[PDB]
Amino acid sequence: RDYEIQRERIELGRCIGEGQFGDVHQGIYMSPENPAMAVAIKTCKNSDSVREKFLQEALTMRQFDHPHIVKLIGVITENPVWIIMELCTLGELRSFLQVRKFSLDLASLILYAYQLSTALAYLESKRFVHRDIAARNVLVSATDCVKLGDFGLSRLPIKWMAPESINFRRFTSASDVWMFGVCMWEILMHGVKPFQGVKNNDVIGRIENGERLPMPPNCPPTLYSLMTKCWAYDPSRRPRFTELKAQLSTILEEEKLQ
Ligand SMILES: CCC(=O)NCCNc1c(NCc2ccc(Nc3ncc(Cl)c(Nc4ccccc4C(=O)NC)n3)cc2)c(=O)c1=O
Numbered sequence: 656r657d658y659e660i661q662r663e664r665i666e667l668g669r670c671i672g673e674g675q676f677g678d679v680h681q682g683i684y685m686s687p688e689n690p691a692m693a694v695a696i697k698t699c700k701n702s703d704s705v706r707e708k709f710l711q712e713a714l715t716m717r718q719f720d721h722p723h724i725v726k727l728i729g730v731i732t733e734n735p736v737w738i739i740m741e742l743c744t745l746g747e748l749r750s751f752l753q754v755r756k757f758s759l760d761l762a763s764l765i766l767y768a769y770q771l772s773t774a775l776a777y778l779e780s781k782r783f784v785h786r787d788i789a790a791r792n793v794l795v796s797a798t799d800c801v802k803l804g805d806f807g808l809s810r811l812p813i814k815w816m817a818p819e820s821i822n823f824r825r826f827t828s829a830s831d832v833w834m835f836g837v838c839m840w841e842i843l844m845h846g847v848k849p850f851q852g853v854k855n856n857d858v859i860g861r862i863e864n865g866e867r868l869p870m871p872p873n874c875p876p877t878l879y880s881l882m883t884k885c886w887a888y889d890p891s892r893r894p895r896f897t898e899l900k901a902q903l904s905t906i907l908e909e910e911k912l913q
Contacts, residue, residue, distance in 0.1 A: 658717070660684070660729040660739055667696060671746065674808050675698065676709050681742055682785055684728065694728055696803075697738040712807030713738045719781075723774035724803045725794060743794035751795045752846035759845075761873065762911035767793075767801045768839045768878075769903040774803050775835060776896035779828045779844055786826050788834035789815050790841035813855040814848070819890060821859045829890035832899070836885025843871040843878070862888070878906050 666683040673679060677700035684694045699709045711880075716727040745751055748767070750834040752759070771793065778785060785806070793811035794802050811821075817833035819825040837849050849868055850858055867886055872877040881902055887893045894902070907913065 658713075658727070660731055662731050662737070664732075665694070665696065665731070665737070665739065666691075671695070675810070676705060679808075684739060689903075692728075693742040693744065695740040695742045697740065697808075699736045709736060709738070712805065715806050716740075719778075719783075721774050721777045723770045723801065724777075725805055733875045739807060743796040743804075745795035745797065747791070748793035748795055748801060749790050749841070749846035752790075752842065756845040759892075760911075761875070762907070763798065763854045764842050765875075765878065765907045765910055766799065767842055768800050769907050771803065771835070771838065771901070772896060772900040772903050775831065779831070779896040782828075783904070784826050784828060785809075785831050785898040786820075786833075787812060787815075788831055788838050790838050790846060793838070811855075813858050814850040814853070817890065818859060818888060820863050827890065828896065829893050832885050832893045832896060833890075834901070835896070837868065838867050839878070839882050839892075840871060843874045862886075875906065875910070878903075881906070 659830045664685045664725060666685070667680055668682040669677050669680065671681050674697060677698040680696040680698065682694055682696045683691050685691045699705060710730060710732065713727055713730050714726070720726075724745060728739040728741060730739065731737040775785070775788070785803075787806075787809045789809075792804045794804045798801055812834075814820060815834045815837045817825075817830035820833075840849060841847065852862070867883060870876070881899065883901070884894055
């Protein structure tokens with residue numbers, strides 16, 4: 656139906672980040688049914704050239720409907736242009752993992768990997784290639800719930816990219832699977848970035864030498880083995896996301912009954 660929201664139904668609040676287009680705020684949305692709802696508000700500092708690209712990102716999220724992908728709520732298309740998104744109260748995943756490193760049990764880390772794999776198996780089933788899977792693009796809705804962030808605000812990430820993406824600019828769901836392996840490593844490392852202190856240009860040579868990100872401390876070997884399957888050099892030998900989801904379900908259940 657209609658995605659336009661009357662500005663008077665939005666109470667703007669504090670800033671919580673930025674983007675290619677401007678600051679992101681949190682706020683409150685009063686609709687006739689379910690008021691009042693907590694939301695994120697994307698703002699655009701500048702034009703009509705930028706207005707074009709800004710609102711196309713909202714269009715992009717319109718096609719998706721998954722419990723572990725942030726929802727588009729609506730848009731305000733008169734200046735100042737706003738995009739209204741579902742709020743993930745607890746913010747960016749990397750910061751959350753760093754702050755709560757010694758307060759999070761392993762079962763929660765595995766839960767986050769599983770939840771993200773369900774979102775990515777959904778995108779794979781829609782034949783949608785993401786190209787920017789990384790912990791920096793995950794949001795924390797609750798201590799038991801993470802979500803892929805807005806795809807526009809997700810937008811080279813060499814240290815996450817599959818070799819065929821680095822070498823030949825090939826992007827498929829199988830190259831997404833490689834990136835997801837790196838994302839899983841980031842989670843089990845409590846938000847450390849991959850290949851710290853390594854130059855981007857040196858990454859592909861290490862991959863082609865057979866080198867891989869090592870097993871994170873306290874990571875179950877079955878889960879690290881799953882990561883290494885995402886990093887098969889030949890993309891046809893990587894699991895599909897629906898297989899990763901099935902394997903993550905059993906790893907999760909063995910760690911803690913759901
Ligand atoms: C409470 C009032 C206040 O002043 N708080 C200051 C903030 N202090 C702290 C935290 N919260 C930051 C924070 C909080 C909530 C979000 N929820 C959110 N929800 C939906 C989208 Cl769509 C979104 N989008 C994005 C927004 C920004 C950046 C990227 C995306 C994105 O989508 N990336 C893929 N971000 C994102 C970031 C901490 O944690 C912490 O400390």
